Amino acid sequence: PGHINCIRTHSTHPDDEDSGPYKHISPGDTKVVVENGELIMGILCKKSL
Amino acid sequence: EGLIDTAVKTAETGYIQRRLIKSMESVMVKYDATVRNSINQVVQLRYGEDGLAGESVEFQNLATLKPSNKAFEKKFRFDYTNERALRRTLQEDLVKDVLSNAHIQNELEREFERMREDREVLRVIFPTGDSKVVLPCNLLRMIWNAQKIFHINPRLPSDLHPIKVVEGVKELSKKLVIVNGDDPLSRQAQENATLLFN
Amino acid sequence: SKTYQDIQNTIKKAKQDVIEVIEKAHNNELEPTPGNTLRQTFENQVNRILNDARDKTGSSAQKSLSEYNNFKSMVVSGAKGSKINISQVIAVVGQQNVE
Amino acid sequence: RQKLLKEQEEKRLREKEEQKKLLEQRAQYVEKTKNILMFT
Amino acid sequence: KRITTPYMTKYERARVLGTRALQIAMCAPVMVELEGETDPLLIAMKELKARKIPIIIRRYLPDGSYEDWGVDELIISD
Amino acid sequence: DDEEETYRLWKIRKTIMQLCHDRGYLVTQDELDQTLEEFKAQFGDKPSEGRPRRTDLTVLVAHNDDPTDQMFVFFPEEPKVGIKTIKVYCQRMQEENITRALIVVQQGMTPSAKQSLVDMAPKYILEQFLQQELLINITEHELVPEHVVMTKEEVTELLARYKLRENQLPRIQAGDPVARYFGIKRGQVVKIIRPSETAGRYITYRLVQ
Amino acid sequence: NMLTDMTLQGIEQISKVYMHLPQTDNKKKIIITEDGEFKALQEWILETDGVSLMRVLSEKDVDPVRTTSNDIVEIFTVLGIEAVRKALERELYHVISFDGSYVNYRHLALLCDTMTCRGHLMAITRHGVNRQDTGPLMKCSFEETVDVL
Amino acid sequence: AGILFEDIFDVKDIDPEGKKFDRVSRLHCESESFKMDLILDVNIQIYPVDLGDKFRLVIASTLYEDGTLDDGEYNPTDDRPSRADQFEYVMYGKVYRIEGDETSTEAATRLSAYVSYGGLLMRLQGDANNLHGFEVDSRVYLLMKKLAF
Amino acid sequence: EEMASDELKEMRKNLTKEAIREHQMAKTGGTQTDLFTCGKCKKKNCTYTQVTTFVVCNECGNRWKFC
Secondary structure: OOOOOEEEOOOOOOHHHOOOOOOOOOOOOOOEEEEOOEEEEOOOOOOOO | OHHHHHHHHHHHHHHHHHHHHHOOOOOEEOOOOOEEOOOOOEEEOOHHHOOOOOOOOEEEEOOOOOOOOOOOHHHHOOOOOOHHHHHHHEOOOOOOHHHHOHHHHHHHHHHHHHHHHHHHHHHHHOOOOOOEEEEOOOHHHHHHHHHHHOOOOOOOOEOOOHHHHHHHHHHHHHHOOOOOOOOHHHHHHHHHHOOOOO | OOHHHHHHHHHHHHHHHHHHHHHHHHOOOOOOOOOOOHHHHHHHHHHHHHHHHHHHHHHHHHHHOOOOOHHHHHHHOOOOOOHHHHHHHHOOOOOOOOO | OHHHHHHHHHHHHHHHHHHHHHHHHHHHHHHHHHHHHHHO | OOOOOOEOOHHHHHHHHHHHHHHHHOOOOOOOOOOOOOOHHHHHHHHHHOOOOOOEEEEEOOOOOEEEEEOOOOEOOO | OOHHHHHHHHHHHHHHHHHHHHOOEOOOHHHHOOOHHHHHHHOOOOOOOOOOOOOOOOEEEEEOOOOOOEEEEEOOOOOEOOHHHHHHHHHOOOOOOOOEOOEEEOEOOOHHHHHHHHHOOOOOOOOEEEOOHHHOOHHHOOOOOEEEEOOHHHHHHHHHHOOOOHHHOOEEOOOOHHHHHHOOOOOOEEEEEEOOOOOOOEEEEEEEO | OOOOOOOOOOOOOOOEEEEEOOOEOOOOEEOOOOOOOOOEEOOOEEEEEOOOOHHHHOOOOOOOOOOOOOOHHHHHHHOOHHHHHHHHHHHHHHHHHOOOOOOOHHHHHHHHHHOOOEOEOOOOOHHHHOOOOOOHHHHOOOOOHHHHO | OOEEEEEEEEEEEOOOOOOOOOOEEEEEEEEOOOOOEEEEEEEOOOOOOOOOOEEEEEEEOOOEOOOOOOOOOOOOOOOOOEOHHHOOEOOEEEEEEEEEOOOOOOOOOEEEEEEEEOOEEEEEEEEOHHHOOOOOOOEEEOOEEEEOO | OOOOOHHHHHHHHHHHHHHHHHHOOOOOOOEEEOOOOOOOOOOOOEEEEEOOEEEEEOOOEOEEEEO
């Protein structure tokens, strides 16, 4: 609802991802990103919902 | 084992919960904004030492805690000397106001001295270097909310006078009142109660 | 059927490991790991071995599961269950403790 | 720079206040040590 | 020299709404236009937004004092 | 021992100086943080029947603003202090205008002597500390917040701002270690400056009782 | 009499002691460096079956600053009520967060405040809360119902 | 117009990190004329590609050639001539990050435009000037088509 | 002790060294790894154990978990 903004990590998120490349473009579709109340990236789970 | 512990855990914990409630049933937040009991005896001067409810607060990060005495400076200092870097950030008619005005430059330097003192405060508050803290307003999401509402585009130079921030924060600090009053004893406590959020 | 082989291999290694701990203590070579009796250092070594064994076999259980697996999907959604629940179902149950 | 020098000299004044306080405490210790003597 | 919060507490809001809704149900004069509803809580809520509740809240201080606050005086929260 | 008693004597004296400095009195910066070597060079480095014998490292210190307000800090040799020992202590406080004092016993004083302490009280306020308790400065501890003893003028302004009877404040009992540190008496408010994890700082007040 | 008890070396009630390097950042020595970093130091700690606290604090080469006691009653007798409050919250926060769960600070502050509000350590049982001068109709609801009336 | 970018690309890898999802794969590419790097998720199920395939990728702001800047809602029933009629793969999305080699003083020479086609991420990366058409939170279309050469 | 035979001195030194070794607490086991960066000290000297991955930093003692 609305225009939420938030960031979360999906449960399978590899620790060594945030370091390397592909940071803002996750191969695994981990790294949940909500902008303007839109789901841009990431799978949802207990960590986000 | 699990079945055993279950059956015993139900009998003991339920009595501990009862005793808790009975030793703190009448504890409440009076209109004084003070935490008293049945006898009117003052428990806490402010609820939770901070005057703020349990529902609205969130986990956040202290930025000025645990950087180092040089990464802190080149990140919270606002140099007004580098002429090339301020035309990147600020528009053309703000980079002269900070490159000539000696009032604006003393003001910006005085603010950093305040942050450097707040930094030592933080380090006697939070030894062990624990960035994580619980506070009312999620600043970083508010900022982000601001970026998405007004369509910021963080790649153009901004028109926000570096002094409107310094003085708007000073005027904002005023409006966040927990302990009302002008008394020195009241100002001190107001200052105290809102120290971490400030 | 490859995972089965890995598990069995791990398990045998484990059973093997414990026999040497038993030999050392049975021939008085297991030196008391500082802050312990003899009988404690032993129990620690054993439980280490066995816990290692369970952890290792649990890992190859997780790694073997297809993305279409239904235990996995309820663990990575966090809906119900944990990675040790898959381990116990597929690979090994583990060490049964009382007190 | 002048403000640094005036603040430094003011720190010297506080050093001097320590000097007068230390002589003062020593100055009454000579009168008092007589009282520790007659006490026993 | 009122020192209390200028905001309507959730508890005040609850009992003022409840209290006013009771009065409404008892055939009180309404202080707001009814666009065609009949629930006393709905009415009371409407009145609340209009700051037209004919009620003042007597807030007791721990010392024994008190401060009276009109409904139109204090800042409604929800 | 002979070496360990010199160590212990100096430690006690250092904590007493930091005490009388927190109480508000006047101590030189040299006597506050002196080290053990010049404590050896100062008396005799020989307490086993020698020169740094007790009742010679006793101290008189005068208040910071009233230079006539003094306080003794006695050091009995008797492990268990008795009435005739504190009778002499009191006997020669009367030759001066000193009222406050402080008895650093080795072992506990006798319960009959404690009476003489209270009996003599309103005219000569004296109190006891065990040498054991003095080995450490408790105010330095990381659990102990900052304690500030409020003045009579500002206790009324605190109770007047909050519109609050002194009866309604939290309590601190007279025997509390931190109460004995400051030498506060019944009916005396204590300010407490706490580092708060949700506020940053917290100031709370405690009434002595 | 000489066999059981002669205290050849050490202090009483300290039934045994363990010697530990801290692994975590919880008991590690923290030191702000000369550049502003925090730099957790790894120093020996001793951890004990038994309490005495005052004979411990007094020992040389022992930190009289950071030497905590776990027994909240020893803390009341040695460091006084305002230290009890801090230490009680630390103990109660340990038994809460151990399992990974989190409780808001308000509630921990509040209980530790109520328990330390009358100067003496006030117990959450009849021997505490009913000895408080609360009034009879409060007391009788809890325990002792006939007796306090 | 409204042509935010165009080049030919080739598939250098289909999913070199290893196929992480069944209907979708991480194309890695470089461009023929502007020498842009590209990462692009595609519906590998409805639109399959192999290594060494060439495609004309036209990132557009609109679909309509006249550049009349449609609203952002689905309407299938539309007479107006589109850009999609000469393409094979067409997607709609948001540019959600723009990132670059900015220094403290001087400007950037290279940009990464990151866009999400409803979950299917893309990073088009290279010369800042060739990427001057992109602005964060703007809407965008993909318009790719395989070159049979 | 200083007047004792060289054999008795060496025996006492060995017994003292063994007593010290026996009273040394066992270092908590786990797999040492540089894969994890500590959020507090930013060093890579960490030890992990899987049960959920528990991680401890060997430099600052900071502990955290991955699910």
